[PDB]
Design an enzyme around this catalytic site. Structure first.
Site, PDB file in Angstrom:
ATOM      1  N   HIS A  39       0.635  -3.554   6.573  1.00 18.39           N
ATOM      2  CA  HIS A  39      -0.657  -3.458   7.228  1.00 18.39           C
ATOM      3  C   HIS A  39      -1.821  -4.032   6.445  1.00 18.39           C
ATOM      4  CE1 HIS A  39      -0.499   0.093   4.690  1.00 18.39           C
ATOM      5  NE2 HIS A  39      -1.826   0.138   4.765  1.00 18.39           N
ATOM      6  N   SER A  43       0.702   3.706   1.761  1.00 23.87           N
ATOM      7  CA  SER A  43       1.014   4.128   3.145  1.00 23.87           C
ATOM      8  C   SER A  43       2.248   3.443   3.699  1.00 23.87           C
ATOM      9  CB  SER A  43      -0.147   3.904   4.077  1.00 23.87           C
ATOM     10  OG  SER A  43      -1.317   4.516   3.577  1.00 23.87           O
ATOM     11  N   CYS A  59       0.843  -1.179   0.000  1.00 28.81           N
ATOM     12  CA  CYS A  59       0.000   0.000   0.000  1.00 28.81           C
ATOM     13  C   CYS A  59       0.887   1.240   0.000  1.00 28.81           C
ATOM     14  CB  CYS A  59      -0.916   0.016   1.255  1.00 28.81           C
ATOM     15  SG  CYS A  59      -1.872   1.517   1.487  1.00 28.81           S
TER      16      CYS A  59
HETATM   17  N1  LIG Z   1      -7.584   6.800   4.650  1.00 26.98           N
HETATM   18  C1  LIG Z   1      -7.126   5.558   4.691  1.00 26.98           C
HETATM   19  O1  LIG Z   1      -7.509   4.721   5.514  1.00 26.98           O
HETATM   20  C2  LIG Z   1      -6.135   5.125   3.676  1.00 26.98           C
HETATM   21  C3  LIG Z   1      -5.992   3.777   3.305  1.00 26.98           C
HETATM   22  C4  LIG Z   1      -5.188   3.390   2.230  1.00 26.98           C
HETATM   23  C5  LIG Z   1      -4.432   4.376   1.595  1.00 26.98           C
HETATM   24  N2  LIG Z   1      -4.467   5.679   2.029  1.00 26.98           N
HETATM   25  C6  LIG Z   1      -3.768   6.722   1.287  1.00 26.98           C
HETATM   26  O2  LIG Z   1      -4.437   6.898   0.060  1.00 26.98           O
HETATM   27  C7  LIG Z   1      -3.473   7.359  -0.935  1.00 26.98           C
HETATM   28  C8  LIG Z   1      -3.539   6.491  -2.142  1.00 26.98           C
HETATM   29  O3  LIG Z   1      -3.023   5.181  -1.852  1.00 26.98           O
HETATM   30  P1  LIG Z   1      -2.728   4.175  -3.033  1.00 26.98           P
HETATM   31  O4  LIG Z   1      -3.888   4.091  -3.929  1.00 26.98           O
HETATM   32  O5  LIG Z   1      -2.155   2.967  -2.409  1.00 26.98           O
HETATM   33  O6  LIG Z   1      -1.543   5.032  -3.769  1.00 26.98           O
HETATM   34  P2  LIG Z   1      -0.963   5.080  -5.247  1.00 26.98           P
HETATM   35  O7  LIG Z   1      -1.032   3.778  -5.888  1.00 26.98           O
HETATM   36  O8  LIG Z   1       0.352   5.781  -5.098  1.00 26.98           O
HETATM   37  O9  LIG Z   1      -1.975   5.987  -6.035  1.00 26.98           O
HETATM   38  C9  LIG Z   1      -1.925   7.426  -5.999  1.00 26.98           C
HETATM   39  C10 LIG Z   1      -2.201   7.953  -7.400  1.00 26.98           C
HETATM   40  O10 LIG Z   1      -2.167   9.394  -7.319  1.00 26.98           O
HETATM   41  C11 LIG Z   1      -1.672   9.856  -8.553  1.00 26.98           C
HETATM   42  N3  LIG Z   1      -1.221  11.207  -8.383  1.00 26.98           N
HETATM   43  C12 LIG Z   1      -0.044  11.654  -7.829  1.00 26.98           C
HETATM   44  N4  LIG Z   1       0.001  12.965  -7.807  1.00 26.98           N
HETATM   45  C13 LIG Z   1      -1.139  13.419  -8.405  1.00 26.98           C
HETATM   46  C14 LIG Z   1      -1.604  14.724  -8.708  1.00 26.98           C
HETATM   47  N5  LIG Z   1      -0.992  15.851  -8.412  1.00 26.98           N
HETATM   48  N6  LIG Z   1      -2.841  14.698  -9.304  1.00 26.98           N
HETATM   49  C15 LIG Z   1      -3.553  13.591  -9.617  1.00 26.98           C
HETATM   50  N7  LIG Z   1      -3.116  12.355  -9.393  1.00 26.98           N
HETATM   51  C16 LIG Z   1      -1.908  12.332  -8.789  1.00 26.98           C
HETATM   52  C17 LIG Z   1      -0.570   8.867  -8.928  1.00 26.98           C
HETATM   53  O11 LIG Z   1      -0.181   8.961 -10.281  1.00 26.98           O
HETATM   54  C18 LIG Z   1      -1.192   7.537  -8.489  1.00 26.98           C
HETATM   55  O12 LIG Z   1      -1.828   6.805  -9.527  1.00 26.98           O
HETATM   56  C19 LIG Z   1      -2.121   7.417  -0.222  1.00 26.98           C
HETATM   57  O13 LIG Z   1      -1.830   8.694   0.329  1.00 26.98           O
HETATM   58  C20 LIG Z   1      -2.294   6.462   0.962  1.00 26.98           C
HETATM   59  O14 LIG Z   1      -1.446   6.681   2.024  1.00 26.98           O
HETATM   60  C21 LIG Z   1      -5.343   6.066   3.005  1.00 26.98           C
HETATM   61 ZN   LIG Z   2      -3.041   1.179   3.498  1.00 30.86          ZN
END
Ligand SMILES: NC(=O)c1ccc[n+]([C@@H]2O[C@H](COP(=O)([O-])OP(=O)([O-])OC[C@H]3O[C@@H](n4cnc5c(N)[nH+]cnc54)[C@H](O)[C@@H]3O)[C@@H](O)[C@H]2O)c1
Ligand SMILES: [Zn+2]
Ligand SMILES: NC(=O)c1ccc[n+]([C@@H]2O[C@H](COP(=O)([O-])OP(=O)([O-])OC[C@H]3O[C@@H](n4cnc5c(N)[nH+]cnc54)[C@H](O)[C@@H]3O)[C@@H](O)[C@H]2O)c1
Ligand SMILES: [Zn+2]
Ligand SMILES: [Zn+2]
Ligand SMILES: [Zn+2]
EC number: 1.1.1.1
Lengths: 374, 374
Positions: free
Chosen positions: A67, A48, A46
């Protein structure tokens, strides 16, 4: 054959920020009262977990991260009643103690026993079950799934269907449930609505899945990496936009596209600027924006509160709003009955020993979820 | 007789910021198609009118301010179907056109025809009905109630009960409805809950009224002016706290008092710092904070989005979330049926000619609502 004994096993230890994980032997103590030791089977990567490496998400080092996972109970400590040796289980990075004011509240899910708000990197008792090179190693979110064996508090584990495919359902431990619940439970996306999803990684794709399940008419994916668009459309995006293609700011573009703003927007990246953009692009009188992405440590955003005064709703959530221990087994059961799909999220499979390659794939933009097998 | 003719009458003109109102003769044009000319009977002094004077709320000057009022229809333009000469009416500073996407939405009330977002200070047709000393004078929020006569668009007026006491029900035109709705409709305060209300002026007292009507168990009033506390308790506050009395920040105090955060908080002042404090004092996992206060023009607040990620909901609203033309007559009917009280909000009643004295009372901290009578 290992009950009550220290287990020596391999884990991915993070000794320092911005460095590869070290795959090396750790000692895993046996479970104390109300603790569960788990033989890990599969764990996802993930973003995170990467945030721990990059210092985006601060937690004490050295640490065993991970996690999003699934495994089989090896042994239980005194007084454990909710799992038994041999049960399939998913560690819960958001615990469900069942006793605190949040657990008792009908909506609440961010149990007060969590280790996310002010991470200490311990078990509930303030100590560690991990030693490496004779040194204590921190836990992460009470789970620490980047290890052949981990020890978790009972409030941080759920028993799941014995016939569950662990190499798939590990995603229910974070990214799927987070995204899907953010749409269906937190935002409460309505039939016929227009949604905008910022970030098309594993979590954003799961948001799209939820928006489509909820009957949205339009689901606009937003990503600066156009390579993410094909999969987003496969799982329900009706259109995708890259902010880099436009002269105007993307909140203006999305407002125009939606004839005055979207019904529901989701920030699924972790940037302060896109949190404000995502709020702005929802309709000013009745729009709802949900923050899902994890922001850089200790940084504040700046915004004009007139965005809210007109009528917008802004919220965020951990783990899709799901009460974790109640919800995880049900989500697994629903998966088994084909109520949603997990394969669209899985782009790569690697052995655990190739964890660093898994992180390289994430950082390059190539993967959605890599699943590691122990 | 006056129908079809220009009326020369008395009004309070604001020629420039940070000056007294000038009470003098204006000319009020007859109503055009779909317009209504109203003989004013009573108008309240709302802090938002003072914001026009102080430059906190930007709208074109010179202007006839006033937006919380009640009067009697003098004449109607061609095509008006919803009011007739002789009807008691309340001008609606938030219109209800009934045709826009917001008006058609079940939860929207900030009609796209409003003059609050991007104030032009005119009628819907882009022109003014007011002149003074040969110069055109701007309207304010499509109402302009600090005048013996005003002209409003049909979408900005509601017919109310012919037996209504206008010197009381004018408060349904802004402050009462805003505060009460913010509690009952926007926040949806629940029975048994704990609420915190920041700002104990006319609007904040109306928030308390709504929280009590919704069955809140605890209602904590917060104001730096302890002279506001007695009336707050009279209308339902269970406790009042003055931030100046404490060494710690009041969000910490309120979190402690509520054993981990309040269920619902309301910002009813108009300060960036108290908006963030009010958000922070609601429970991190399931708390809801509503912004009611009007912020200073063009200023951004700073906040940590972890406050939202844990599960808080942050929203704001204009006019208590009420669809204005549907709601105002029902609120008046409910008042006549003794469902709520308005007298607790009224501390002073003055002739219109004493408008400046009424504003001085507000600014000095000495009044809640002054009602000006024509
Ligand atoms: N709230 C929660 O419980 C929880 C759970 C899981 C993940 N997260 C968070 O959610 C986010 C996404 O996680 P993920 O899907 O595993 O990450 P990921 O796979 O890195 O996806 C993020 C996406 O954002 C895109 N991106 C980056 N910068 C920009 C921008 N300026 N504009 C538009 N798109 C952009 C990037 O290209 C990628 O496809 C991360 O910050 C995690 O830490 C939060
Ligand atoms: Zn996560
Ligand atoms: N959203 C809407 O539709 C709407 C409607 C009506 C009023 N308003 C706004 O709501 C706000 C309140 O209006 P009102 O009740 O007429 O004003 P008011 O009568 O001036 O009351 C404001 C109260 O805030 C108190 N106060 C000032 N600073 C602080 C502080 N730092 N901490 C705690 N208390 C403080 C002050 O002592 C006073 O009792 C103003 O900003 C209005 O412009 C908004
Ligand atoms: Zn709990
Ligand atoms: Zn409208
Ligand atoms: Zn007002």
């Amino acid at each position: 054959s290992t009950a009550g004994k220290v287990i020596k096993c391999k884990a991915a230890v993070l000794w320092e920020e911005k460095k590869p994980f070290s795959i090396e032997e750790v000692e895993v103590a046996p479970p104390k009262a109300h603790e569960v030791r788990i033989k890990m089977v599969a764990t996802g990567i993930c973003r995170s977990d990467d945030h721990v490496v990059s210092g985006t998400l601060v937690t004490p080092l050295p640490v065993i991260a991970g996690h999003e996972a699934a495994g089989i109970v090896e042994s239980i400590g005194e007084g454990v009643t909710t799992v038994r040796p041999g049960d399939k289980v998913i560690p819960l990075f958001t615990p469900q103690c069942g006793k605190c004011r949040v657990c008792k509240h009908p909506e609440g899910n961010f149990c007060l026993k969590n280790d996310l708000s002010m991470p200490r990197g311990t078990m509930q008792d303030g100590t560690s079950r991990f030693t490496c090179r004779g040194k204590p190693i921190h836990h992460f979110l009470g789970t620490s799934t980047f290890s052949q064996y981990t020890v978790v508090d009972e409030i941080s584990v759920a028993k799941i269907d014995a016939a569950s495919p662990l190499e798939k359902v590990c995603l229910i431990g974070c990214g799927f449930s987070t995204g899907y619940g953010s749409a269906v439970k937190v935002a409460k996306v309505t039939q016929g609505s227009t949604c905008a999803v910022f970030g098309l990684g594993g979590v954003g794709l799961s948001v799209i899945m939820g928006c489509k399940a909820a009957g949205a008419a339009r689901i606009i994916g937003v990503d600066i990496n156009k390579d993410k668009f094909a999969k987003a459309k496969e799982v329900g995006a009706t259109e995708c936009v890259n902010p880099q293609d436009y002269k105007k700011p993307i909140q203006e573009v999305l407002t125009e596209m939606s004839n005055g703003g979207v019904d529901f927007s989701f920030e699924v990246i972790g940037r302060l600027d896109t949190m404000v953009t995502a709020l702005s692009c929802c309709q000013e009188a009745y729009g709802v924006s949900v923050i899902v992405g994890v922001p850089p440590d200790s940084q504040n955003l700046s915004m004009n509160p007139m965005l809210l005064l007109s009528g917008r709703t802004w919220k965020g959530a951990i783990f899709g709003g799901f009460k974790s221990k109640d919800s995880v087994p049900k989500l697994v059961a629903d998966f088994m009955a084909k109520k949603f799909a997990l394969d669209p999220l899985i782009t790569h499979v690697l052995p655990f020993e190739k964890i660093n390659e898994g992180f390289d794939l994430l950082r390059s933009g190539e993967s959605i979820r890599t699943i590691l097998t122990f």
